[PDB]
Write a protein that binds this ligand. Structure first.
Ligand code: NAI
Ligand code: NAI
Lengths: 336, 336
C-alpha cells in the first residue's frame, strides 16, 4: 500500500472504467495531489469520473499523438488500465482491439521512457509468478494484447529503466461495473459484461439466473477495492521490472455465486445447478503469496461481503444502469 | 518443395527485399502463374523487383486500408516476409517498428481470414521446435514483433482456419542483400546491415575486416536460395498451424567467416582473431530435423559455396551497391 502516494501526481489511463474509477476513488482517499484520468469512454461512462478539484479528465485516447506530445514529466505514478473490453469484443474486431489494447501500451511507454519523476508504472495484466508464455491457448486478441503489454513492460524496463510493475488479476467484481457501459463493441457482451453484474442485475429483476452446465465452473473472484489496493501496493513497493498476482486465493463456483446472489437479493426462482466433477476444472489460478510477502498485500474481502456491497450499490443505481443498458437495445436486436 | 506451386497465384509481402527478391526469382523458376509483390521499399530497392509479365508490384504498405480492401480471393499462397529492418533500427524507433513489423501481420491476417482459395500462408519468423516463449531476453522491438507475428499466426489458424506455417530462420546471407537498401532507418545499420555483406564489401575494397572480440561468436549461417526453397517447402507441405526451423545445422565463427571471405577475395590485410572459449557461446540454434522429416527439406549449400556465389554477385554489382550506400552519407555523418 502506502501513504507513499500522499501528495503525489498520478495518471490513470483507463481511469473512467470499472477498476479505474475505483482506483481513482481510493487514490483521492489516500490524499494524492492530482489525478490525470485519460479515457476515451469506449467502455466507460462519464459518471464514473468525478468532477473534483484534484481530477483532470482528458476524454481522449492514450494513442493520440497530440495528447502524448503534450504530456509533461509531472507524474510520480502512472497506472495503465486501458483495454478493449473484452474477450468477445476483441474476437469480433481484432483491429479495434489492437488500437485500444496493444498500441495503447506501446505509445504510452514510448512517451514515458525518458521521464525522470516517475517512480512506478503499473500495468494491469491478465491472470508463483512466471514469465514464460505459450503461443497456444490464447483464446482471443484481447488475451494476446494483454500478454503483449507484459512483453513491452519488460522491454522498456530493461532498455530504458522504465519502472514497470505488471499486476496480474482476474475475475474482479464490485461497485462501479455498469452493464452496457460505453459504446457498442460488436456483441451482447457490451451489455452482459461479466457473470457477477449479469447475475446481480437479473436477480434484482426477479429473473432466473442462467447457469451454463449447472455452474460447475470455478473462479477466483476478487473484490474491486482489494484490486485497487493491490495496484497501489504495486505502485508504492513493487520491484521495477517485476510481476505480482493480485488474487483472492479462493475459488467459488458459478453455482455458489448464483446461490449467494439469489439469497442476498431474495430471488426465489429456480437454479439448474449440477455437482462439480474432477474434469470440470482440470486448471491454474494465481498464487497471492509473492504480493503478501513483498508488498504486505492480501485480498481479504470475502465473496459474501463483496457481493453485499456490490448488490447494495447496484440497487441504489439500478435506474441509471437500466438507462445505460437501453442505449444498446437496437444493436442487441440486430445481433446475428 | 514443389511443383505444387506451378501455375499458382502467389502474394509476396516484403517481396522486394533480400529474402523476398530471392523467393520471387525461385517462384518464377518453378513456373508460378502470377506473383503480387507488395512492398513499400522501406528497406529495399526497386531493382530487386523484376518487370515481368507475371509480376504485379504494389509499392504500398501492407497496412494500407485501401490496398487491403482491394485484395481479392485470388491467391493460392501468401508469403509474409515484411519486417522493419532490423534490431538496431527497431530500438531507435519502436513505433516505426510496430507499424512495419507488428501491425503488418495483424492487418494482413485480418484481411485473409475468410479467403477460400488460400492453401498456405507462410510467415518468416525469427530463429526441436517449441511454442513456449519467455518475456525476457527479447532484446529489441524487432524481436518482440517477430514473436507477436507467431502469436497471430497461431490465433488466426485456431479461430479462422487461416492455413499459417511459421518458418523460423536466422543468419541468412547471399546475393540480393544490398548494403544501404531503402530509406534511412535511424542508425548506421541501415548501411551495415549484417556481418556477411559488410565483410564482403570491405574485403572487396581491400580493407581490414573488423572482428569484435577476436570473432569468437558463432552463427548458423544459411544461404538465401536454401531459405527460399525452405519457404516454398513450408508453403507446399507444411502443416497448417505449424512451425519449422529452416536452418543449416552448421555453426561458423565470425573469425572463420572473415578468413574465408579474405581468402576468396584476395584481401591480404590482417585479422585480429582469438581462440573461441567455452563461455563465448554458452547457446541455442535451431534443429533442421523436423523440416527434413516432414518436408524433405535440407539446407545443403556450404558456407564455402554460398560465400563464392555471394562474392561473385557483389563484385558484379559493386558500383550499383556503392551508389545505393552513398545515399546515406549525410545521415551517417550526423549519427550521434
Ligand atoms: N475486470 C477484470 O476481471 C479484469 C481486468 N483486467 C484488466 O484491468 C484493466 C481495467 O479493466 P476493467 O476496468 O475491468 O474494464 P473497463 O473496460 O471498465 O476499463 C478499461 C478502460 O479503458 C478505457 N479505454 C479503452 N480504450 C482506451 C484508449 N485508447 N485510451 C484510453 N482509455 C481507453 C475504457 O474506456 C475503459 O474506461 C484492463 O487493463 C483489463 O484488461 C485484467 C484481468 C481481469
Ligand atoms: N535475413 C535474416 O537473417 C533473417 C530474416 N528474417 C525475416 O525474414 C523476412 C525478410 O527479411 P530480409 O529480407 O532479411 O529483410 P528486408 O528488409 O530485405 O526485407 C523486408 C521487406 O519488407 C518490406 N517492408 C517493410 N515494411 C513494409 C510494409 N509495411 N508493407 C510491405 N512491405 C514492407 C521492406 O521494404 C523489405 O523489402 C523478415 O520477415 C525478417 O524478419 C528472420 C530471421 C533472419
Amino acid at each position: 500500500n502506502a501513504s507513499k502516494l500522499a501528495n503525489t501526481n498520478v495518471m490513470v489511463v483507463g481511469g473512467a472504467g470499472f477498476v479505474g474509477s475505483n482506483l481513482v476513488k481510493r487514490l483521492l482517499e489516500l490524499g494524492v495531489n492530482q489525478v490525470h484520468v485519460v479515457d476515451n469512454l469506449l467502455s466507460a461512462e462519464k459518471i464514473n469520473v468525478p468532477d473534483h478539484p484534484a481530477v483532470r479528465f482528458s476524454e481522449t485516447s492514450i494513442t493520440d499523438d497530440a495528447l502524448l506530445a503534450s504530456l509533461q514529466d509531472e507524474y510520480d505514478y502512472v497506472f495503465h488500465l486501458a483495454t478493449y473490453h473484452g474477450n468477445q469484443s476483441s474476437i469480433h474486431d481484432p483491429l479495434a482491439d489492437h488500437e485500444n489494447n496493444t498500441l495503447t501500451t506501446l505509445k504510452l511507454y514510448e512517451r514515458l521512457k525518458h521521464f525522470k519523476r516517475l517512480k512506478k508504472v503499473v500495468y494491469s495484466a491478465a491472470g508463483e509468478e512466471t514469465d514464460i508464455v505459450s503461443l497456444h491457448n490464447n483464446d482471443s486478441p484481447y488475451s494476446m494484447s494483454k500478454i503483449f503489454g507484459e512483453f513491452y513492460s519488460v522491454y522498456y524496463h530493461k532498455q530504458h529503466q522504465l519502472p514497470t510493475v505488471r499486476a496480474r488479476f482476474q475475475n474482479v467484481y464490485g461497485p462501479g461495473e455498469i452493464l452496457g457501459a460505453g459504446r457498442w463493441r460488436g456483441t451482447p457482451a457490451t451489455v452482459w459484461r461479466n457473470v457477477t453484474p449479469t447475475f446481480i442485475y437479473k436477480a434484482l429483476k426477479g429473473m432466473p439466473l442462467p447457469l451454463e452446465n449447472g455452474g460447475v465452473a470455478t473462479r477466483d473472484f476478487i473484490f474491486v477495492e482489494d484490486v485497487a489496493n493491490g495496484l497501489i501496493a504495486c505502485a508504492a513497493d513493487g520491484t521495477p521490472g517485476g510481476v505480482y498476482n493480485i488474487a483472492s486465493g479462493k475459488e467459488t463456483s458459478i453455482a455458489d455465486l448464483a446461490t449467494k446472489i439469489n439469497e442476498i437479493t431474495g430471488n426465489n426462482t429456480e437454479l439448474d445447478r449440477l455437482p462439480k466433477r474432477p474434469w470440470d476444472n482440470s486448471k491454474r489460478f494465481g498464487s497471492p503469496e509473492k504480493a503478501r510477502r513483498e508488498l504486505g498485500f492480501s485480498a481479504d474481502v470475502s465473496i459474501d461481503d463483496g457481493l453485499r456491497k456490490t448488490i447494495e450499490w447496484t440497487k441504489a443505481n439500478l435506474a441509471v444502469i437500466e438507462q445505460i443498458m437501453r442505449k444498446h437495445d437496437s444493436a442487441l436486436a440486430t445481433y446475428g
